[PDB]
Amino acid sequence: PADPISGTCIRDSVPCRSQLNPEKRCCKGFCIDILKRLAHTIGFSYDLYLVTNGKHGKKIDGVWNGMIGEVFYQRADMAIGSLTINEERSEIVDFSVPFVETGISVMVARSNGTVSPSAFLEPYSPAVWVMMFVMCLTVVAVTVFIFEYLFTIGKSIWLLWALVFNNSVPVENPRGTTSKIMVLVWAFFAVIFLASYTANLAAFMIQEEYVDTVSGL
Amino acid sequence: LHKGSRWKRPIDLALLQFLGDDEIEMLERLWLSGICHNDKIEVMSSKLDIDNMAGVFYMLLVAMGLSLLVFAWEHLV
Amino acid sequence: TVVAVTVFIFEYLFTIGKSIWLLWALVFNNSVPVENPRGTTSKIMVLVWAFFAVIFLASYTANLAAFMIQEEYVDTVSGLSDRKFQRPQEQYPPLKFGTVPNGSTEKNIRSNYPDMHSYMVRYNPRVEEALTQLKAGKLDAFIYDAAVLNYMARKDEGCKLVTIGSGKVFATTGYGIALHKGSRWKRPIDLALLQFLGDDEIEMLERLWLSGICHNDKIEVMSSKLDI
Amino acid sequence: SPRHTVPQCCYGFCIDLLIKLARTMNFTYEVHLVADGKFGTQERVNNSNKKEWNGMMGELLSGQADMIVAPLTINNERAQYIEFSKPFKYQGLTILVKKEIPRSTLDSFMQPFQSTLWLLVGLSVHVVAVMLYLLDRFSPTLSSAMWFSWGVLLNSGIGEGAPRSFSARILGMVWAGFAMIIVASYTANLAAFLVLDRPEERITGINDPRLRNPSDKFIYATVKQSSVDIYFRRQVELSTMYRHMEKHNYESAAEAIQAVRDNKLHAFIWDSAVLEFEASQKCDLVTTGELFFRSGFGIGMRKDSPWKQNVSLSILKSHENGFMEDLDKTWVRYQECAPATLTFENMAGVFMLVAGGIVAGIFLIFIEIAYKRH
Amino acid sequence: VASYTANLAAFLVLDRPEERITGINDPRLRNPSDKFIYATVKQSSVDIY
Amino acid sequence: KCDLVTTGELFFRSGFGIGMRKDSPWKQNVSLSILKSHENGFMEDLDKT
Numbered sequence: 006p007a008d009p010i011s012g013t014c015i016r017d018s019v020p021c022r023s024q025l026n027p028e029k030r031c032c033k034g035f036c037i038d039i040l041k042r043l044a045h046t047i048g049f050s051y052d053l054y055l056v057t058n059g060k061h062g063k064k065i066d067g068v069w070n071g072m073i074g075e076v077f078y079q080r081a082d083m084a085i086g087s088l089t090i091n092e093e094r095s096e097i098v099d100f101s102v103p104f105v106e107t108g109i110s111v112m113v114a115r116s117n118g119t120v121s122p123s124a125f126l127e128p129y130s131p132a133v134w135v136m137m138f139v140m141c142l143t144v145v146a147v148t149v150f151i152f153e154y155l156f157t158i159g160k161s162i163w164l165l166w167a168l169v170f171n172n173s174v175p176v177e178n179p180r181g182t183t184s185k186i187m188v189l190v191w192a193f194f195a196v197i198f199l200a201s202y203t204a205n206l207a208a209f210m211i212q213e214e215y216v217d218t219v220s221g222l
Numbered sequence: 223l224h225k226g227s228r229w230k231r232p233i234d235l236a237l238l239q240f241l242g243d244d245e246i247e248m249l250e251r252l253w254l255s256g257i258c259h260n261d262k263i264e265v266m267s268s269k270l271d272i273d274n275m276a277g278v279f280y281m282l283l284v285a286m287g288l289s290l291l292v293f294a295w296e297h298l299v
Numbered sequence: 300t301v302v303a304v305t306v307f308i309f310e311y312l313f314t315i316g317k318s319i320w321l322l323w324a325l326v327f328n329n330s331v332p333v334e335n336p337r338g339t340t341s342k343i344m345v346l347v348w349a350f351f352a353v354i355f356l357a358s359y360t361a362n363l364a365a366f367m368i369q370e371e372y373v374d375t376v377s378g379l380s381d382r383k384f385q386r387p388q389e390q391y392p393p394l395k396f397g398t399v400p401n402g403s404t405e406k407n408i409r410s411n412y413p414d415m416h417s418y419m420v421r422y423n424p425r426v427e428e429a430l431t432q433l434k435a436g437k438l439d440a441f442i443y444d445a446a447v448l449n450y451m452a453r454k455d456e457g458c459k460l461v462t463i464g465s466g467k468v469f470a471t472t473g474y475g476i477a478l479h480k481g482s483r484w485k486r487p488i489d490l491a492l493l494q495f496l497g498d499d500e501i502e503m504l505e506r507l508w509l510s511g512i513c514h515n516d517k518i519e520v521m522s523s524k525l526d527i
Numbered sequence: 528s529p530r531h532t533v534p535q536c537c538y539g540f541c542i543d544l545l546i547k548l549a550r551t552m553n554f555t556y557e558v559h560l561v562a563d564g565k566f567g568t569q570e571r572v573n574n575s576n577k578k579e580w581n582g583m584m585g586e587l588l589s590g591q592a593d594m595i596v597a598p599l600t601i602n603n604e605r606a607q608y609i610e611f612s613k614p615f616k617y618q619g620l621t622i623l624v625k626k627e628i629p630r631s632t633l634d635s636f637m638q639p640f641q642s643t644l645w646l647l648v649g650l651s652v653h654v655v656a657v658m659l660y661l662l663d664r665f666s667p668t669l670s671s672a673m674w675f676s677w678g679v680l681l682n683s684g685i686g687e688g689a690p691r692s693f694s695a696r697i698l699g700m701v702w703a704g705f706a707m708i709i710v711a712s713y714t715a716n717l718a719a720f721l722v723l724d725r726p727e728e729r730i731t732g733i734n735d736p737r738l739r740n741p742s743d744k745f746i747y748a749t750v751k752q753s754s755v756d757i758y759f760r761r762q763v764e765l766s767t768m769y770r771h772m773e774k775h776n777y778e779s780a781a782e783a784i785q786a787v788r789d790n791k792l793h794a795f796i797w798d799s800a801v802l803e804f805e806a807s808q809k810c811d812l813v814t815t816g817e818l819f820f821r822s823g824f825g826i827g828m829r830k831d832s833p834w835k836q837n838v839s840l841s842i843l844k845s846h847e848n849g850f851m852e853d854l855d856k857t858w859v860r861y862q863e864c865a866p867a868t869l870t871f872e873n874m875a876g877v878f879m880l881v882a883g884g885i886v887a888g889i890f891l892i893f894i895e896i897a898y899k900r901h
Numbered sequence: 902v903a904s905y906t907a908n909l910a911a912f913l914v915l916d917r918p919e920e921r922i923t924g925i926n927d928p929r930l931r932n933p934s935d936k937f938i939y940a941t942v943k944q945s946s947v948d949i950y
Numbered sequence: 951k952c953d954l955v956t957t958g959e960l961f962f963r964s965g966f967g968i969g970m971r972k973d974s975p976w977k978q979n980v981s982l983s984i985l986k987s988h989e990n991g992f993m994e995d996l997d998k999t
């Protein structure tokens with residue numbers, strides 16, 4: 006409704022004239038803005054006739070009630086607003102170019118917090134894991150051979166694997182002159198490997214919001 | 223419009239010109255826009271991730287079974 | 300407190316300073332020799348502290364990952380009136396800042412800041428073909444008209460910031476339409492331009508003709524750990 | 528309050544500029560503050576828009592004052608009626624918002640792992656340890672096995688009695704490997720949470736979706752009857768904003784800033800030349816966004832005033848060749864005043880754990896001593 | 902060691918490929934450059950638009 | 951083609967059409983046939999195929 010002292014409708018509005026078989030109202034919105042621009046371009050004078058006999062349109066025992074009813078007959082030659090296009094309405098009336106799209110769409114709540122998959126614990130490529138295993142076996146064989154040159158049989162493999170994981174695992178350390186250097190060099194590789202693995206997971210844990218993608222009804 | 227109304231052509235071209243420059247772009251943004259129109263948010267994944275937990279435990283169970291199998295093989299002799 | 304509790308529990312059922320030594324080792328990397336106090340309940344205390352060490356270390360490493368995410372910082376001069384420019388021979392002088400000589404910017408600075416212009420003339424008769432923008436790797440600051448300096452900054456491959464904004468510009472003036480003295484066109488043009496500023500003008504026109512790839516940006520950079 | 532011409536004393540940028548102008552052209556000035564605090568706008572009264580010139584603008588136009596030295600913005604409406612000298616300061620509308628303190632999160636240390644995950648690892652340790660004891664006793668103790676499994680997971684050196692059987696050894700190694708995976712996953716998850724846990728982004732200009740879609744939770748306004756009101760009314764794209772600001776439009780440039788500090792407001796849109804000073808002087812507010820109505824100030828004068836030519840020259844010559852820096856750096860620039868750090872959200876959970884263990888340890892020792900008594 | 906891992910995590914997290922165009926409002930398109938070659942089909946509705 | 955990805959948002963939202971000469975008497979029949987058959991039970995059949 007217009008303000009008691011407003012009188013005429015304020016800017017960005019048009020005089021709504023709700024009519025039936027009196028009060029002044031202001032009608033504004035999307036389609037009204039379209040109507041104003043059409044009048045300015047085409048160059049006619051409009052007169053809103055806000056309907057009250059029904060809804061956007063329906064057929065009752067051969068009678069059209071609503072905006073289509075008014076457009077039908079000769080009561081008002083336009084029905085600007087929210088009017089869908091279908092065969093029945095387009096058969097008795099003459100629509101225009103669709104300025105807004107519509108349809109029977111589906112609304113689905115987005116799945117907040119996508120969870121990392123089961124295989125999210127492997128930032129390393131399959132060749133990355135295989136190469137690490139082969140190097141561990143080669144290093145273990147080198148350590149045992151060096152120790153034999155100057156006991157330990159399976160301890161080297163046990164010790165070699167412990168360093169790559171958390172060091173908190175009991176293990177006998179093979180004493181020697183150069184075998185220790187090999188252990189340290191492997192130990193540095195374990196530290197560098199573990200740091201890289203933990204760093205990657207931090208990048209993998211950063212997920213997004215995933216919404217189920219239906220096929221469209 | 224009324225069936226056969228002469229206004230069909232002038233209005234048809236007028237609307238088609240609106241789509242060219244503004245129309246939905248300007249008008250729909252004013253009247254049919256919301257706070258998060260596009261929205262793209264990164265979420266710190268909680269480590270519940272029963273798929274993630276299941277995978278780690280699945281390997282653990284397989285290793286546990288392998289240990290049992292090797293123990294039986296050694297105990298065979 | 301935990302170390303005192305462990306020693307007291309051990310005394311109830313040797314170790315004097317070993318508990319403090321052992322307690323500190325767990326909080327850091329466990330790869331440190333230490334004698335473990337044998338007991339019935341003291342071990343439970345060690346494990347509970349050990350869990351606190353694991354939780355603490357994980358939190359500490361996690362935070363550094365957040366701290367290492369830095370940004371691009373541009374030196375914020377005071378706008379041609381900073382102590383760096385005037386009387387440069389007070390602290391470590393900035394890399395020689397020059398401009399195109401035999402112009403208008405040089406005349407203004409010489410007439411207003413003779414001391415700065417004395418040192419500012421190290422390398423800058425006429426021209427220099429404004430190549431200092433491409434050679435802004437051996438000299439720090441460049442002084443010249445702001446209208447073009449903004450354009451070259453925006454249009455440049457990559458981009459470099461300009462120590463200027465609403466303020467920080469020495470002799471801020473504008474671009475006009477030089478009409479004849481007393482011409483009647485002054486009023487109609489004056490109002491016409493003032494209306495352009497209201498709706499489009501610079502907004503629409505400057506974006507079309509005076510815009511670059513990185514007009515604005517704030518790029519996060521993975522800080523290299525050189526960081527002396 | 529007398530409310531009738533109480534003699535005060537003024538000083539500052541504009542007054543300093545006025546004194547310079549008077550000296551260089553022989554004025555004799557008598558300052559006089561506007562009767563009603565208001566910059567000036569065209570109001571409609573009795574179907575006569577031009578009749579109502581509210582604020583200081585009306586005072587100059589009516590005849591009370593022949594010069595309007597003040598931070599008066601230059602726009603079309605005023606330029607049509609009064610004469611504006613060359614700008615003495617270039618500025619533009621900008622948004623001032625309160626600085627958001629970077630608080631932390633993760634009130635508990637166990638947040639990254641769900642309650643089920645903690646239980647799964649808890650029973651996993653027990654089941655693994657018991658099986659190891661059975662394998663060791665098979666010959667192809669419980670206390671030793673429990674100590675070893677617990678120590679490996681917690682990364683403690685209390686481990687003793689390493690498994691001897693090959694089947695036990697392989698199971699133990701896989702158990703240790705699982706321990707590394709769990710701890711590494713926890714740290715990676717925490718790093719992702721901490722990195723992605725930052726306060727809400729600021730407005731960043733008038734193009735922000737928050738402003739373009741006004742909501743009752745956001746209260747941004749301006750000063751009533753100013754150039755900001757005129758700028759928004761003229762534009763048609765900024766239709767939603769004006770209706771929102773018209774509701775909470777304030778009464779002065781000082782009241783609005785106080786509202787922002789008190790949290791009653793959320794975003795103030797005003798001249799950048801003033802907001803940038805308040806942010807610098809007050810260490811609680813930060814101005815965001817980019818200037819979107821770049822204009823200047825001006826010493827407005829009546830259309831027939833003969834001072835226009837020698838005020839405009841005086842501004843260009845004195846103010847903006849050796850003077851602007853002197854004045855601006857003295858009254859505007861001279862006055863001058865990071866990811867969150869875990870403080871007591873992580874420690875509270877961890878510390879409660881340590882204290883909780885200590886009480887349990889005291890109970891365990893009493894139980895242990897009682898058992899040893901018999 | 903902790904500093905090294907944190908630095909690596911920051912590098913890995915911030916190390917992602919260049920963002921895609923994401924509409925006609927992207928600065929790359931609004932500021933054409935010789936390094937970007939975007940075109941359409943000759944004599945179509947795109948040319949008229 | 952699993953090598954290309956479409957980015958951005960539609961910015962010239964329009965439609966296709968079976969254009970005909972201005973005096974063609976098929977316009978009413980064709981327009982009804984599109985609305986009735988194509989876009990009630992047929993569009994999904996054709997589009998999904």
Ligand SMILES: *[C@@H]1O[C@H](CO)[C@@H](O[C@@H]2O[C@H](CO)[C@@H](O)[C@H](O)[C@H]2NC(C)=O)[C@H](O)[C@H]1NC(C)=O
Nearest residue numbers: 551552553833834835836837838839840841844
């Ligand atoms: C300001 O305006 C006055 C006139 O209002 C100028 O006065 C003239 O000055 C010139 C040069 O000194 C004389 O030849 C004229 O005879 C003066 N006329 C009057 C009426 O006094 C004055 O020069 C101008 N000054 C500035 C700063 O522009």
Ligand SMILES: *[C@@H]1O[C@H](CO)[C@@H](O[C@@H]2O[C@H](CO)[C@@H](O)[C@H](O)[C@H]2NC(C)=O)[C@H](O)[C@H]1NC(C)=O
Nearest residue numbers: 092096975976977978979980981982983984986
């Ligand atoms: C296709 O067009 C034909 C004519 O061009 C339509 O035939 C008319 O149908 C109505 C109702 O069935 C009759 O009253 C007319 O006499 C028919 N015209 C002629 C010339 O016979 C037909 O209805 C149209 N069909 C569709 C689906 O649009």
Ligand SMILES: O=C(O)[C@H]1CN(CCCP(=O)(O)O)CCN1
Nearest residue numbers: 060061062063087088089090107
């Ligand atoms: O085209 C116009 O007539 C109306 C038709 N409306 C149908 C609503 C069917 P429900 O109420 O949602 O079951 C949608 C809006 N436009």
Ligand SMILES: *[C@@H]1O[C@H](CO)[C@@H](O)[C@H](O)[C@H]1NC(C)=O
Nearest residue numbers: 549550551552553554555556
């Ligand atoms: C300006 O010049 C006049 C004429 O000499 C002089 O009387 C006046 O004192 C000067 N300045 C002022 C207004 O003080």
